[PDB]
Each structure stands twice: as structure tokens, then as C-alpha cells.
């Protein structure tokens, strides 16, 4: 059955709770149990109200993104199809209860610093079921990265670290991410000058330049294990697919395109053009402390831009990481 607020977040983890992000599924909190930074996603479920101006999701609706994240995470602890760059999913809980008084106050200093476009949490019931899914903290995401990045160097490392997992999660999962903007990239210093993933059995490593990237936000995603395919139905939506401002907006009609609006298909290629949309966001929406001065770092640039030039060609992250000349 579910679990009070306590059995996940008992006083000393609900006190050390700071909001790091929203969206209209819910709240995402920043808490240290055992000395060890963790990211707590809270969603609202089963429950009438609005919350941040659309319905709650059913416990089924909620599932979807509870499998993808386990698969995901458990690839880290895998052989033949290993990668560590998804986020690890530490626990998952039902919870019953109206929102911590604590989570209140946390979601107050956010609102007050940055400002937030939800619903303050605080009209919640005592009979209010929420998902309580906890995570790895996976450091701080590429959109609030783009004035921090150093050279372009880790540019490569980043979408070649994004390159290998999406081929591991293919070859493993079918797996499609569906929406992998630039919020949905996180990074992270590492002391490790070598990151290893398996593919199909073969191992192979990346240089870090100290940066370890996980791919959060199995929202939309889409994977299969022995022909059960889990994946968000969107045939019947609107928003998504009107969008504009952003070549991100563009990136769902290609994928509508692509897949014929059948989404429960597999079309690996939605990978590729989100790696393109990032790439794109690497050579234009990004800005790097250091530019490329000297003579082999703009040699790392015209490898990228003749990347952004040529990887929409390729038909899946596994075909880009085995044929492509940029990871060669
Ligand atoms: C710093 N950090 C965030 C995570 C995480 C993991 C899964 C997920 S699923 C959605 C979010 C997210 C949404 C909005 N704004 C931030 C994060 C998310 N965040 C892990 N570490
Ligand atoms: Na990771």
C-alpha cells in the first residue's frame, strides 16, 4: 500500500529539501541523505483538481516513465549493453498525504529567487496519492550551461558521451528519449579521464575533459523488452506539434513525420535528430570561455560543424557512434 511523506522524506531529508525545477507534471526537489546529494521528482496522481492547469496523470499514465527510468538506470550494472549515462533511479514510492509544510517553504524561496509558473502545492488533501520517484543528482543541465562550458573540445566529449548511450539504449531497449532538449542534459565534474560503455559486446571509452553527462526525462520516451513496447501515445495532441521560437518545436513535427504519428513504432532516427537539435544548440545557442584560438582545436570544430552538416544522414545513434567519421 502507499506510505506517508515520512517513509521517503523523514525530518532531516524533508529540512535539507531545495527546488532546482518544475514543470506542469510537478515539482523536482534537491535533498542530502547519508552525505550524498539526491533529486526528487513529485507527481500529483489520480486526483480530480489541476494541478499547474492540467489533470493529473492515473497511476497507468505514470508507469511508463517509472519502467523507462528503471531500464535506463539499470544499464549502468549491465555487460553486453552497458552505459552509466542515463540517471540513476535510487527508489520509487507511492505516497499519501497533503503536500510537507517543508516542501512548501522550499517551493516558496524558489518562487520568491527565480520564480515559478505553477500552482502552489498547498491545496492538497490528506488523501492525495503522489509518485515519488528518487534519483542520482546528475549535476546542472546544458541550457544553464551555455555561458559555462570551457572550450569546444568538451562539446565533443558531450555529444559523443550522448552518442554512445542512446546506441546502448537502442541496441538494448529500442529505446527513443523523444525529448531531449537542452533541460534534459545534465552534467556533472568527474575525476575519471576515461568513460566506458559496451555496445553489442564491444567496449570502447570517451574522454570526459572532466564532465560525466546523464540524460534525464523519460516523459515521451518510447523502449520494448520481448515485443511489450512502453511509450507516451501522442497521435492525439496538439500543443506539442503547434510550438515555434525554438528549432526544438521543429524536432516533434520531424518526428510526427518520421514515424507517421504511429508511436508506438520503433524509429531510431528520433535520436538522431535530437542530437542534431543539441548539436545545433553546441554552434549557435551556446557561447564557450574559451574560443578556438589555436590550430587542433578548430580542427574539434570543423569535425563538429561537418558533424551538424552530415549526421542527419544516418538512421539511428548506433549507426552515428559506429559510422561516423567525428568519433573515429
Ligand atoms: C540535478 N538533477 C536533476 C535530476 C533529475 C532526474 C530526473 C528527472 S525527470 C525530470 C527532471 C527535471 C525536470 C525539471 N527540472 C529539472 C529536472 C529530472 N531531474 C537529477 N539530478
Ligand atoms: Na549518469
Known sequence: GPVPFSHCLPTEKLQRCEKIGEGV????????????????????????????????????????????????????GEVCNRTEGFIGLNSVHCVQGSYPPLLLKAWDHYNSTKGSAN?????????????????????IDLEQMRTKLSSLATAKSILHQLT?????????????????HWGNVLLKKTSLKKLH????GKSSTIPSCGLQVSIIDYTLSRLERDGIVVFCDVSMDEDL??????????????????????????HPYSNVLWLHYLTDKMLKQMTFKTKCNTPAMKQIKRKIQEFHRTMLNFSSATDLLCQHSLFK
Open 241 to 266: 506539434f503547434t510550438g515555434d521560437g525554438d528549432y526544438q518545436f521543429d524536432i516533434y513535427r520531424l518526428m510526427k513525420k518520421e514515424n507517421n504519428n504511429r508511436w508506438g513504432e520503433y
Open 197 to 200: 560503455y559496451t555496445l553489442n
Open 164 to 180: 554512445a548511450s542512446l546506441a546502448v539504449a537502442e541496441a538494448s531497449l529500442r529505446f527513443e528519449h523523444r525529448d531531449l
Open 25 to 76: 507534471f510537478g515539482e523536482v526537489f534537491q535533498t542530502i541523505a547519508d552525505h550524498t546529494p539526491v533529486a526528487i521528482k513529485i507527481i500529483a496522481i489520480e486526483g480530480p483538481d489541476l494541478v499547474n492547469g492540467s489533470h493529473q496523470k492515473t497511476f497507468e499514465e505514470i508507469l511508463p516513465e517509472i519502467i523507462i527510468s528503471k531500464e535506463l538506470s539499470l544499464l549502468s
Open 119 to 139: 500552482d502552489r502545492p498547498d491545496f492538497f488533501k490528506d488523501d492525495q496519492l503522489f509518485i515519488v520517484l528518487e534519483f542520482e543528482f546528475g549535476g
